[PDB]
Amino acid sequence: PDFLKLFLNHTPTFDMFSRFCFPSDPERSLASIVLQKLPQMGSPGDPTSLLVDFADTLIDLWHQCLSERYYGPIYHLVSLLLYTLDLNAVEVAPHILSSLIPVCATTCRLVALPRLNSADGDLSGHPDAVVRQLCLNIDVTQCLSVLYLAASGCLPQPLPQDTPQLEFWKTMELDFVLTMLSPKNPEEDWSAMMILLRTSVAPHSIGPIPSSATNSTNRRSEAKNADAVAATLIDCVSSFLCEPPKWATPRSAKEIAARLAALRTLMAFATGHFGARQIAESDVAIPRLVTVLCWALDRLYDSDLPPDSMSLLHQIIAQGTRLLHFLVTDHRTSDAANISTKLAASHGGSQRYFLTLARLNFAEEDLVLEAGIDAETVELAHELLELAVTP
Amino acid sequence: PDFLKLFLNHTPTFDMFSRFCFPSDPERSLASIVLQKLPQMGSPGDPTSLLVDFADTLIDLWHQCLSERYYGPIYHLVSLLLYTLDLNAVEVAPHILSSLIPVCATTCRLVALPRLNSADGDLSGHPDAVVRQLCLNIDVTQCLSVLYLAASGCLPQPLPQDTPQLEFWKTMELDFVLTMLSPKNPEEDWSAMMILLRTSVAPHSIGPIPSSATNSTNRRSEAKNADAVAATLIDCVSSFLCEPPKWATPRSAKEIAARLAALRTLMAFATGHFGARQIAESDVAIPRLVTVLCWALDRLYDSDLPPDSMSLLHQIIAQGTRLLHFLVTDHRTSDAANISTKLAASHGGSQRYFLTLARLNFAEEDLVLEAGIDAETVELAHELLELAVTP
């Protein structure tokens, strides 16, 4: 007696890829069809052709798994996509996204939608159905990881049809973004999405691109769509840096990590002219950003301060003042951001803004600031204070 | 900022295969050399050729990892071997074992040897070296799993050079067996080995085959080797069913699981004529086996009895009496086993043997036995009792 016992003890819990078969044909193993379809893959001389054909066979098998809700072999197919895609992602991903992205979307939604319906996002008992097993069977975080690898593969390289970034995010949909960012999601899935959005910075549109009405393009309509998507994502993302997810314990390092991640994605948007302008014109991004600078500074004086929480707080201060200086000082956004008509902290208005700028300027006098914040940070804060004292 | 943040949050802890590079050439990624060596793989029309070439490239890369003690990418190379091998193992493994087995052996030994040197097998602190990280970095259980998959691939099929089983176990070495079975190993590694030994039942030799002295074969010497290896493995394996590893809590279900596994491997040996004869002639196997039957029966009457512990105990009783009946009753082994000159229980000698046979025969009268042990079990126990009462 050999196989049954390895099947017993082998299950961290792992299962063998050869055992899985579709219930539509329970005597044909997945390994079998992969093998008989294998020698037909790839045109000669093109290894990327082989990778594309192979990843296509994986995605098709996973799509069929979803159709028959046989969720066993999802993990292994995702894993093989991670290896095959990681191999030459910049060449392989643009051929794949058309089918890969909707499969990731529905696969993630199988878990995210009951989470979002769940009171606090916990699946323990509350649905009392096959959903309970469904959370255990499929990992969202690896799916999002395949999406992130495919996005980075599509990202523009240093060296007409749309760029592959642009296809990727035209076929990426916004309600998926907003649900995957819902604070009812766990840490790994949420941070996975916040990181994924950094690859959506296109020259005219951050975030995903809504589908066009006709087969012919409408410049006016798309302009309006880009504008709306931008304002919405910036509202969503900026909301976190003043109010992190519930799983960020409200004094823990994870909170600081989350606020830092939100800030990082806003920076990602600001890399492009369009994203920066949209942040500057946002009615909530800047007063939230000022609010979190005041927050992080005041927490740097915290009664008890134990990744290092302190180092993260200095990253929030340095990178956050970097961003705010970029927005207020650059000519492209100055006339919008610097308006600052009540654009300041939530708790104390313009006063706390000016004060936290001062305390950042006098880094030397405060002992915690002398040994902390960089010199260029003090320089930026000094310029911003020089404009802040009088318009 | 994109990659550094996914690299942060992505690490259960997983790392990306593309990042790994050898310190002998820190600017050449593993993915790169895999890709440029990829289109050269396989002869046309042979998909098994492709799998063999690919697995060879993985094993060579892993051997180079061992040489440079760069232990990062071991997990991923093992994992790809698991998929590629699981795909068509019966056709692919015989081409691989020559290089695969010694790499598994030294890879496992990196962890097993400090464990065996450790007082109770715990690596926490006691070495206080790179060994502490070394246990964390490489998983033995997946390595043993690759060995088990390759063994089952070599196992004889229903449809001169030696059989691929026989090469496998000629190149498998016994001190590796005995160290991997040491009770200082964790549950998963130990049970992985006990399961692996079931594939070593050859027509003239169970266990691994020692290397021959000359290039020309010596039938006499090999005969003696097979005899010695058999007696030793049977002593090792039989020792557990009366004295399980330390991690088997001495009343837990895991203990019963372990004794059951040992018994299963002994059964595996008995499938062959040679193994059965060697068990029968063993000076310790039968009195240990009788001892564990008496044990399991007495524990079936245990004060408190909560996988199901009870079901496992019935598996030990049914399969154990099956084996003992096979040994004592079959003509090939009868004249050796049935001698039974003090060949009985350790605690109470021949008395407890005869008594436990009786209680198994009167299954109906005992309520726990009426609802438990099968009818064929009672039949075998009746025959064995009929010989036991008078020789």
Side-chain angles (χ1 to χ4, degrees), chain A residues 95-370:
Chain A
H95 300 88
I96 287 173
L97 53 88
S98 65
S99 67
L100 186 277
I101 297 171
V103 177
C104 294
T106 62
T107 303
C108 296
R109 283 177 176 173
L110 292 177
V111 174
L113 296 174
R115 285 181 176 173
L116 188 63
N117 195 0
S118 176
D120 62 354
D122 189 358
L123 277 301
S124 298
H126 292 285
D128 192 359
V130 66
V131 175
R132 302 178 70 188
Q133 294 176 357
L134 184 62
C135 180
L136 296 174
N137 203 172
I138 60 172
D139 191 359
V140 178
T141 307
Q142 52 175 348
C143 297
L144 296 177
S145 300
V146 182
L147 289 176
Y148 178 81
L149 187 61
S152 67
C154 297
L155 195 67
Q157 301 298 320
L159 74 160
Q161 292 182 356
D162 293 333
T163 183
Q165 181 186 6
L166 194 61
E167 290 184 355
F168 186 84
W169 291 97
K170 281 186 178 180
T171 180
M172 187 75 77
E173 64 183 2
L174 181 61
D175 283 331
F176 182 74
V177 180
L178 296 177
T179 53
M180 294 306 296
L181 290 179
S182 178
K184 296 179 183 178
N185 287 316
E187 175 179 359
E188 292 182 352
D189 298 333
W190 186 79
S191 296
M193 188 66 184
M194 286 298 297
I195 294 170
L196 179 56
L197 292 175
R198 297 185 179 95
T199 63
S200 67
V201 173
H204 292 287
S205 65
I206 64 171
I209 293 92
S211 297
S212 68
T214 65
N215 291 318
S216 64
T217 62
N218 189 359
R219 188 177 298 278
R220 179 179 179 267
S221 298
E222 291 183 352
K224 291 184 181 292
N225 295 118
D227 193 358
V229 172
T232 299
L233 288 174
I234 292 169
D235 192 356
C236 183
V237 172
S238 67
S239 67
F240 292 104
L241 53 83
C242 291
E243 188 170 0
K246 294 179 183 179
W247 54 262
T249 301
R251 297 290 296 273
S252 176
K254 287 186 181 292
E255 179 182 3
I256 298 169
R259 298 178 187 268
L260 179 65
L263 194 150
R264 291 284 188 88
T265 300
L266 290 175
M267 293 173 70
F269 294 168
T271 61
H273 298 283
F274 175 68
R277 181 69 179 172
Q278 290 300 114
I279 295 172
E281 292 181 354
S282 178
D283 59 353
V284 301
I286 291 171
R288 291 176 181 176
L289 185 61
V290 172
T291 303
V292 71
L293 286 175
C294 297
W295 179 76
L297 183 62
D298 290 334
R299 287 297 308 273
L300 193 61
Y301 294 101
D302 195 359
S303 296
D304 51 353
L305 186 64
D308 288 330
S309 178
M310 180 174 173
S311 66
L312 295 177
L313 288 176
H314 294 291
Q315 292 183 358
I316 291 175
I317 293 172
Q319 290 181 353
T321 56
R322 174 76 71 189
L323 181 64
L324 184 59
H325 185 276
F326 182 81
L327 297 175
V328 180
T329 59
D330 190 359
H331 62 280
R332 298 177 189 269
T333 66
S334 64
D335 58 356
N338 201 167
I339 300 298
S340 68
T341 54
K342 193 177 180 180
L343 280 300
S346 66
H347 181 75
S350 179
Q351 185 181 4
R352 287 181 63 87
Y353 171 68
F354 194 81
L355 295 175
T356 55
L357 288 177
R359 290 187 291 175
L360 288 175
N361 192 358
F362 297 97
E364 294 177 352
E365 182 68 28
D366 285 330
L367 298 177
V368 296
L369 295 177
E370 183 182 2

Side-chain angles (χ1 to χ4, degrees), chain B residues 31-324:
Chain B
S32 63
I33 187 166
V34 175
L35 193 149
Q36 67 86 30
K37 190 174 178 67
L38 182 61
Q40 297 176 358
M41 295 180 183
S43 296
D46 294 333
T48 63
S49 178
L50 177 62
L51 295 177
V52 169
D53 290 332
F54 182 75
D56 283 329
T57 59
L58 295 176
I59 296 169
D60 292 333
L61 293 176
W62 170 32
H63 187 192
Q64 184 175 1
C65 293
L66 292 173
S67 66
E68 297 182 358
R69 73 259 187 92
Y70 191 71
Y71 301 111
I74 309 302
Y75 176 79
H76 299 284
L77 297 174
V78 171
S79 181
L80 293 175
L81 285 174
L82 288 175
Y83 293 104
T84 59
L85 187 62
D86 181 73
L87 191 62
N88 196 359
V90 299
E91 293 290 327
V92 177
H95 300 88
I96 287 173
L97 53 88
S98 65
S99 67
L100 186 277
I101 297 171
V103 177
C104 294
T106 62
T107 303
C108 296
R109 283 177 176 173
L110 292 177
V111 174
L113 296 174
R115 285 181 176 173
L116 188 63
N117 195 0
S118 176
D120 62 354
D122 189 358
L123 277 301
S124 298
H126 292 285
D128 192 359
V130 66
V131 175
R132 302 178 70 188
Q133 294 176 357
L134 184 62
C135 180
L136 296 174
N137 203 172
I138 60 172
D139 191 359
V140 178
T141 307
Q142 52 175 348
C143 297
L144 296 177
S145 300
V146 182
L147 289 176
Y148 178 81
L149 187 61
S152 67
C154 297
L155 195 67
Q157 301 298 320
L159 74 160
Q161 292 182 356
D162 293 333
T163 183
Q165 181 186 6
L166 194 61
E167 290 184 355
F168 186 84
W169 291 97
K170 281 186 178 180
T171 180
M172 187 75 77
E173 64 183 2
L174 181 61
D175 283 331
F176 182 74
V177 180
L178 296 177
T179 53
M180 294 306 296
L181 290 179
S182 178
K184 296 179 183 178
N185 287 316
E187 175 179 359
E188 292 182 352
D189 298 333
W190 186 79
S191 296
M193 188 66 184
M194 286 298 297
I195 294 170
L196 179 56
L197 292 175
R198 297 185 179 95
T199 63
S200 67
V201 173
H204 292 287
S205 65
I206 64 171
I209 293 92
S211 297
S212 68
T214 65
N215 291 318
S216 64
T217 62
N218 189 359
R219 188 177 298 278
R220 179 179 179 267
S221 298
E222 291 183 352
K224 291 184 181 292
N225 295 118
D227 193 358
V229 172
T232 299
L233 288 174
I234 292 169
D235 192 356
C236 183
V237 172
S238 67
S239 67
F240 292 104
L241 53 83
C242 291
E243 188 170 0
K246 294 179 183 179
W247 54 262
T249 301
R251 297 290 296 273
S252 176
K254 287 186 181 292
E255 179 182 3
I256 298 169
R259 298 178 187 268
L260 179 65
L263 194 150
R264 291 284 188 88
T265 300
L266 290 175
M267 293 173 70
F269 294 168
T271 61
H273 298 283
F274 175 68
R277 181 69 179 172
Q278 290 300 114
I279 295 172
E281 292 181 354
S282 178
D283 59 353
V284 301
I286 291 171
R288 291 176 181 176
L289 185 61
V290 172
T291 303
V292 71
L293 286 175
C294 297
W295 179 76
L297 183 62
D298 290 334
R299 287 297 308 273
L300 193 61
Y301 294 101
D302 195 359
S303 296
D304 51 353
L305 186 64
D308 288 330
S309 178
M310 180 174 173
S311 66
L312 295 177
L313 288 176
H314 294 291
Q315 292 183 358
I316 291 175
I317 293 172
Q319 290 181 353
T321 56
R322 174 76 71 189
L323 181 64
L324 184 59

Side-chain angles (χ1 to χ4, degrees), chain A residues 57-73:
Chain A
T57 59
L58 295 176
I59 296 169
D60 292 333
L61 293 176
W62 170 32
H63 187 192
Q64 184 175 1
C65 293
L66 292 173
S67 66
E68 297 182 358
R69 73 259 187 92
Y70 191 71
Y71 301 111

Side-chain angles (χ1 to χ4, degrees), chain B residues 316-332:
Chain B
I316 291 175
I317 293 172
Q319 290 181 353
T321 56
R322 174 76 71 189
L323 181 64
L324 184 59
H325 185 276
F326 182 81
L327 297 175
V328 180
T329 59
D330 190 359
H331 62 280
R332 298 177 189 269

